[PDB]
């Protein structure tokens, strides 16, 4: 849902993040999250606070940065949020929007993104990611292509 947030919503979330981030180091700790929760009448344990962070902790460093905070504010988990971002990346290559990346689409978009590969490199990239062997890369294959 983080992709559906408006500009004013994001600007308000920036103000909120700054109030959570007491020491201004750009990350929210369990200590900082706990302060906020208790100001709102809750008493989460340290384990419950760490779990709130883990649910959005895409990089696994144990703290919330602002992109992860946007996941939290959209009331989403990190797995759904990452799937939204992978699907956005997929759509960049799927120029004709049919749900499959062709060799010509991969060559075209990679070229315009500054990496001009030979026709042989593109065919090789397609074949390696093409699991079901239909000659194209669907979304589920695109995810494994990126791991
Ligand atoms: Ca901090
Ligand atoms: Ca993190
Ligand atoms: Ca396509
Ligand atoms: Ca395929
Ligand atoms: Mg969304
Ligand atoms: Mg966006
Ligand atoms: Zn995200």
Numbering used by the authors: 1 to 147
Published text:
Herein, we describe the development of a photocatalytic method for the rapid and efficient dimerization and site-specific functionalization of peptide and protein diselenides. This methodology, dubbed the photocatalytic diselenide contraction, involves irradiation at 450 nm in the presence of an iridium photocatalyst and a phosphine and results in rapid and clean conversion of diselenides to reductively stable selenoethers. The utility of the photocatalytic diselenide contraction transformation is highlighted through the dimerization of selenopeptides, and by the generation of two families of protein conjugates via the site-selective modification of calmodulin containing the 21st amino acid selenocysteine, and the C-terminal modification of a ubiquitin diselenide. The unique reactivity of the selenol side chain of Sec, namely its low pKa and high oxidation potential and nucleophilicity relative to Cys, has led to significant interest in leveraging the amino acid for a number of applications in protein science.
To probe the limits of this PDC dimerization methodology, we next subjected a recombinant calmodulin (CaM) protein diselenide dimer, bearing a Lys-148 to Sec mutation [CaM (K148U)], to the PDC conditions. This selenoprotein was expressed using a Sec-incorporating amber-suppression platform in the evolved Sec-dependent E. coli β_UU3-T7 strain and employing an engineered tRNASec, based on recent reports by Ellington and co-workers. Motivated by these results on peptidic systems, we turned our attention to the late-stage functionalization of the recombinant CaM (K148U) diselenide dimer protein 12. To this end, 12 was first mixed with super-stoichiometric amounts of a synthetic hexaethylene glycol diselenide ([Se-PEG6]2; 16). This led to exclusive formation of the CaM-PEG6 asymmetric diselenide 17 after mixing as judged by HPLC-MS analysis. Addition of PTA (66 equiv.) and 10 mol% [Ir(dF(CF3)ppy)2(dtbpy)]PF6 (5) and LED irradiation at 450 nm led to clean contraction to the desired PEG6-functionalized CaM (K148U) 18 in 5 min (91% conversion). The PEG6-CaM (K148U) selenoether conjugate 18 generated from a multi-milligram PDC reaction was submitted directly (without purification) to a crystallization screen. A crystal diffracted to 1.95 Å resolution by X-ray crystallography, with the refined structure of 18 nearly identical to ligand-bound conformations of CaM published in the protein databank, thus confirming the retention of higher order secondary and tertiary structural features. Importantly, this highlights the biocompatibility of the PDC conditions.
